[PDB]
Subunit: 115 residues, 4 copies
């Protein structure tokens, strides 16, 4: 699978489990079309979102529902969600891992693109 999402919790030092993730693909009219979604596993990962066939070049958005995660932990968060927007390119490495590190008032996101 060409796209994986990994989410970590910087407050507990653990995978961020059961975090909803929604992936969208930018349509010709500039709107965001639902593409794939899921919830992170006990390892904070979400595999099997798409296939090589369907994951064509284009602009994608990965929305991580961080607010609901923090609310479940009873911690007041800042962001509505974490959004990661990027262009999928065929010339570069073919496996994309979108990693996110979550804190209540901060998040970082990193792309690990490999062959």
């Amino acid at each position: 699978c060409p796209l994986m999402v990994k989410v970590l919790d910087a407050v507990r030092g653990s995978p961020a489990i059961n975090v909803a993730v929604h992936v969208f693909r930018k349509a010709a009219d500039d709107t965001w079309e639902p593409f794939a979604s899921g919830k992170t596993s006990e390892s904070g990962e979400l595999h099997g979102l798409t296939t090589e066939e369907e994951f064509v070049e284009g602009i994608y958005k990965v929305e991580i529902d961080t607010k609901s995660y923090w609310k479940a932990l009873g911690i007041s968060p800042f962001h509505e969600h974490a959004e990661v927007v990027f262009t999928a390119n065929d010339s570069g490495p073919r496996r994309y891992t979108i990693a996110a590190l979550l804190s209540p008032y901060s998040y970082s996101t990193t792309a690990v693109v490999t062959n």
Copy 2:
């Protein structure tokens, strides 16, 4: 300055200068409406986006155009932009500093929220 944006470049160890920033507010019909925009200064800061009066309760999106920034430095980065989406002023007026730390394949954003 109820809203300030600060952007740093983690490759150069400097402020990220001349970075375009667009702010939107969610309208009643759930669409994003343009709210304010500007560019970071030599200090990597953007002040004067709004006023206390105009910065009412709402869901705001701060779009930082990071791709253009990296491309002008000769780097083809991963992200199109860094988007920061948050509810503001729902418990009264606050001062928000949205900070972003940029690398070609990673970014981190932090909010510093203080009471007037």
Copy 3:
């Protein structure tokens, strides 16, 4: 202010106040020698650690006592401290801002280096 330290709390979205900071310089015998120390203010900043004259070329270590900070807030964090080790002024005098973003099980540190 050739050297400034700024510390933010990513759980509260605020400056990290009253954080102890110890600066060391590597001596000729390769040991760490105390250089300066202080605590962050209400703004999360620590100024006045040194002067242009005293801040000579060398390898410096900025120790930020993050564990004590978290424990006073009721959190048992992972790290003992955040250590920032760097060569300074080897190409002439520079102004260094060492920024740290703290979470209980993670921290990020950035350096902003400018010419006088």
Copy 4:
């Protein structure tokens, strides 16, 4: 293995390969005693540093030689290295993953402690 180190490169969006890592254990006299070391793999990981038997409670330091990594890439770095200092505790989760995200003038480190 109870201790793993994972290093990523935020400039290239890749694992940070062949990064030297040195682990030290704080001795009774407050000095740092060499404990384990290695170089990250092609996946940016370093496994097999120690064993459950030897990784007793105590204060450890993980030093990641980031300066040499950046120099090999021809990029001027700020830090001499990234140091991660922590206390190993038996009551909590028993597997420690020390992750580091590297940029020339910035790094972040995260501990993922699991059971």
